[PDB]
């Protein structure tokens, strides 16, 4: 290609016309695989309108369109190209076309793409922002004001959003250098708050980068649903990592974690660990850490001397290094004459040693799930198919397949693994690996394969968490990324494949299958728990957690889109009746663990979709309120809480998580809607308070008090009803003792008075207490009588200890009442 490029360049040294335009159009293919000066001189003449005007028909707009493709090709070659382009004046030369008159919107839209490839390197954005004379930033700002079409105001916004990210990293560096070097007074909460605020912008401008910082194809329109465009896109992350490297991001996070003032701050440790967590979830991000390998170790030490993020990062970096070594071994040494070569035995031994602790198997199975890193082990077996290298590879592949949950490597490698497992029928480590990839028999991962996976699960549902039924962990992992989109990001375009996926799920009987999966998983951990297999190995725990998470994600994806805006009703009372028991079994211990907590969040999210789908007009009729999607879910949850003596403390956590936080337009809309539905289940809510009042347990009592406070803070009628219930409990407790004899005070009475004292501290409960004791309601004289009894008890104390607690509680109640 180089020889061809030399011939073309020398032939048209001074030739202009159709031949020159043909050469310009042909060059970009050649450059893929001092001519740079001549190429730069050619590029600046193809962008000149004074040369385009002097050419015949159809040859004048093909010279300008072909001059914006030499920019996108010369800049990507390296810094030596961008430096020459900037020295020639590409920034100013690309703005004489956008500002020019009568230019079509498809040639202006191409000049933006040439500029996006110039400011994509740190040498470029320095010249774009700081003028060389007006800068390019000011020119683009003026260009936005001018009236443009829909696709030109969208292309110019991507350049602006990319410039913002470069200017949030520049202020972080200055702020940190001034914070640490100078002061360490000036280290106040009005200055640290900027650091946490700036570090939440870096995490925000990289999560939304693929959507608001890329240049869309010329034939794509900014619609909220993606239609009429090429399917491919561009990856912005290499540029972002190029900016982070130039600003020395890692050499500064270590500075914030190694300074007397802000290292101890819990809000800065958490803020900087969310950028690092996101950055290490990709192959490009993990390779970013190993580029400056010296600065990564110091960061690990700084994060470590202060929960297992440092250990996980160390394991991931070691795993990636070993994988790179494995790939490099089969390149320099194409043929392995010595099967047991010492270098590869050492590499395999280190990889095997990493996989002992549970935090090591979650990092070995994570790096191997990115790109095509699983090919090294398959190649190592195929070369040798015993050798010791074979055994280690078999063990490592079993580990990766068992542990990893993002099964995208299986869409291409499942063909090799199955035939390799068929080849060796006597190895006990391959007869098990072939059982995991059982559903993946002649399967192509699109929507058309969803019914096959659902059919396989439906058939082999009887064997869950058994040696034979280990293919259900993979048949549910595969089905959970084909049809379940990742969480939405602001600025996205709603792809229409995800609606068809959910339609296919509903057509292939996904609902019943997933309900059966959840029910079967529930009735193993509780009734068949008599075997007391309480996660004896790391397999029984990880497998169960993965199945639970996958089923929950599928259920949430189906129910969110189905019950989106209350268009359609839902009455199947099986989903909000097995999520409670799953919460009791799994989320029983905060939960933490980064996996037990997410299950609770998903359970709450699935339960909450029954409230959003509500009718705001049919809020008066008794039939329309007692048979709503809200009321049925609430009845099922409340009944489920009061069905198992063991399931009380966990149920109160669920009830607390459902209800809104204790005490503008949307705040009152939901709070009063909650009280309207809660009023129907009066007998169910009253049963919670009375049943859990007669027990002795500090966590249970504290949860009960918190729930009472929340329900009182909801709205007024519910608070009054709860106060009626509790004071009626007081009335019956004091009426249980015969008035003929001396009044009997028990520990239950002391607990009840403590409950009244705890409730009375809140103004919302205060108003209800005052309204009830005022006696305005007809038939409200009993509460006045019981208050008079309390006053008489105050006037007539005693010497008993229980009498002492009663007197102190009643005095505290009266003190709160006087306020």
């Amino acid at each position: 290609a180089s020889v061809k490029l030399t011939e073309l360049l020398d032939l048209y040294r001074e030739d202009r016309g159709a031949k020159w335009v043909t050469a310009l159009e042909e060059i970009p293919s050649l450059i893929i695989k001092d001519s740079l000066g001549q190429l730069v001189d050619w590029t600046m003449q193809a962008l000149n309108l004074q040369v385009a005007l002097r050419q015949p028909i159809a040859l004048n707009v093909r010279q300008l369109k072909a001059g914006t493709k030499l920019v996108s090709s010369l800049a990507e070659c390296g810094a030596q190209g961008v430096t020459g382009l900037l020295q020639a004046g590409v920034i100013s030369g690309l703005f004489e076309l956008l500002f020019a008159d009568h230019v079509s919107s498809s040639l202006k839209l191409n000049a933006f793409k040439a500029l996006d490839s110039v400011i994509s390197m740190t040498e470029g954005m320095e010249a774009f922002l700081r003028g060389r004379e007006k800068s390019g930033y000011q020119k683009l700002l003026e260009l936005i004001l001018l009236d443009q079409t829909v696709r030109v105001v969208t292309a110019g916004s991507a350049i602006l959003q990319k410039c913002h990210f470069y200017e949030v990293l520049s202020e972080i560096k200055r702020l940190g250098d001034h914070l640490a070097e100078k002061t360490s007074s000036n280290i106040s909460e009005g200055e640290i708050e900027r650091l946490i605020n700036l570090l939440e912008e870096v995490f925000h401008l990289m999560e939304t980068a693929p959507h608001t910082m890329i240049q869309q194809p010329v034939k794509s329109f900014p619609t909220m649903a993606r239609i009429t465009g090429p399917p491919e896109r561009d990856d912005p992350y290499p540029v972002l990592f190029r900016y982070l490297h130039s600003h020395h991001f890692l050499e500064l996070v270590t500075l914030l974690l190694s300074i007397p003032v802000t290292s101890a701050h819990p809000g800065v440790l958490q803020a900087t660990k969310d950028v690092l967590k996101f950055l290490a979830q990709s192959q490009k991000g993990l390779l970013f850490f190993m580029s400056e390998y010296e600065a990564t170790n110091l960061l690990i030490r700084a994060l470590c001397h202060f929960d297992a993020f440092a250990l996980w990062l160390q394991d991931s970096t070691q795993t990636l290094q070993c994988i790179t070594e494995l790939f490099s071994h089969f390149q320099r040494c194409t043929a392995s004459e010595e099967t047991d070569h010492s270098d590869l035995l050492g590499t395999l031994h280190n990889l095997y040693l990493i996989t002992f602790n549970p935090v090591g198997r979650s990092a070995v199975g994570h790096v191997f799930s990115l790109e095509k890193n699983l090919q090294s082990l398959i190649t190592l077996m195929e070369y040798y198919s015993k050798s010791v290298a074979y055994n280690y590879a078999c063990i490592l592949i079993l580990v990766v397949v068992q542990s990893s949950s993002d099964v995208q490597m299986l869409e291409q490698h499942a063909a090799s693994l199955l035939k390799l497992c068929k080849a060796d029928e006597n190895n006990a480590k391959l007869q098990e690996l072939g059982k995991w990839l059982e559903p993946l028999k002649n399967l192509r991962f699109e929507i058309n394969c969803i019914p096959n996976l659902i059919e396989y699960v439906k058939q082999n549902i009887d064997n869950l968490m058994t040696p034979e039924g280990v293919g259900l962990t993979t048949a549910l992992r595969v089905l959970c990324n084909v049809a379940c989109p990742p969480p939405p990001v602001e600025g996205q375009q709603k792809d229409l494949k995800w609606n068809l996926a959910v339609i296919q799920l509903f057509s292939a009987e996904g609902m019943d299958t997933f309900i059966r999966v959840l029910q079967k998983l529930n009735s193993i951990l509780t009734q068949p728990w008599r075997l007391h297999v309480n996660m004896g190995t790391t397999l029984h725990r990880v497998t169960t957690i993965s199945m639970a998470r996958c089923t929950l994600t599928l259920l949430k994806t189906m129910l969110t889109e189905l019950l989106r805006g209350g268009s359609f009703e839902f009455k199947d009372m099986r989903v909000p009746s097995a999520l409670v028991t799953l919460h009791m079994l799994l989320c029983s211990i905060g939960r933490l663990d980064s996996d037990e907590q997410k299950i609770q969040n998903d359970i709450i999210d699935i339960l909450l979709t029954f409230t959003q789908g509500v009718n705001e007009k049919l809020t008066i009729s008794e039939e329309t309120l007692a048979n709503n999607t809200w009321s049925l879910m609430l009845k099922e949850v409340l009944s489920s809480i009061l069905k198992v003596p063991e399931g009380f403390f966990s149920g109160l956590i669920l009830l607390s998580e459902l209800l809104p936080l204790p005490l503008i337009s949307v705040a009152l809309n939901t709070r009063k809607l909650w009280s309207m539905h809660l009023h129907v289940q009066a007998k169910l809510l009253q049963e919670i308070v009375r049943s859990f009042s007669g027990t002795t347990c500090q966590p249970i009592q504290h949860m009960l008090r918190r729930i009472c406070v929340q329900l009182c803070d909801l709205a007024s009628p519910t608070a009054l009803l709860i106060m009626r219930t509790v004071l009626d409990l007081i009335v019956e407790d004091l009426q249980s003792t015969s008035e003929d004899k001396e009044k009997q005070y028990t520990s239950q009475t002391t607990r009840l008075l403590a409950l009244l004292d705890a409730l009375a501290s809140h103004k919302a409960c205060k108003l209800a207490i005052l309204h009830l004791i005022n006696g305005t309601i007809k038939g409200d004289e009993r509460y006045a009588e019981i208050f008079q009894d309390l006053l008489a008890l105050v006037r007539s104390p005693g010497d008993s200890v229980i009498r002492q607690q009663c007197v102190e509680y009643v005095t505290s109640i009266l003190q709160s009442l006087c306020d």
Partner: protein
Amino acid sequence: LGRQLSQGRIAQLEAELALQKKYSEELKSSQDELNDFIIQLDEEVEGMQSTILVLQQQLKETRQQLA
């Protein structure tokens, strides 16, 4: 009573939904065809835009030549 109402709901609803699902599919296909038509309309539009820009540029060239 309730059982007869449920059975009638079952029968008539399943029948008429099965009948009108096909017309819903026809509507989807018609919208897909309309989107295709819009695609070629767009393509023709930018073709005319480029050709017209060529015409203006050669007109301006003749202008600079004559003056």
